[PDB]
Amino acid sequence: PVFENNNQRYYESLPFKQLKELKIACSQYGPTAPFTIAMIENLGTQALPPNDWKQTARACLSGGDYLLWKSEFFEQCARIADVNRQQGIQTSYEMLIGEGPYQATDTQLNFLPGAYAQISNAARQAWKRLP
Secondary structure, three states, X not given: OEEEOOOOEXXXXXXXXXXXHHHHHXXXXXXXXXXXXXXXXXXXXXXXXXXXXXXXXXXXXOHHHHHHHHHHHHHHHHHHHHHHHHHOOOOOHHHHHOOHHHOOHHHOOOOOOOHHHHHHHHHHXXXXXXX
């Protein structure tokens, strides 16, 4: 996730215990079981750059579910990016999905503060549409 100190935005790795528990939940209950979704909602309250959501999905979902998630995540981001464009908000599609010039985690740390909630919304909407 993304944090701030007095001088800069910086990145810290996802807490391992939370990630492990989510992986186990996906395997033991399913990716959209109530317990699993509760954990996704909790993760959704943090400022995850796109790569943290992609890492989480890759770690926790089956290969097949990962690609279903990723495709829907991109669609959700495209929707949000279109709204941002109309509203003059400087958060783009490639920023939201973390691709193109924004592929590397180090380039995902200085978005508008509100971008991280948008990313979270897209990621969680995509997760909730898994079968």
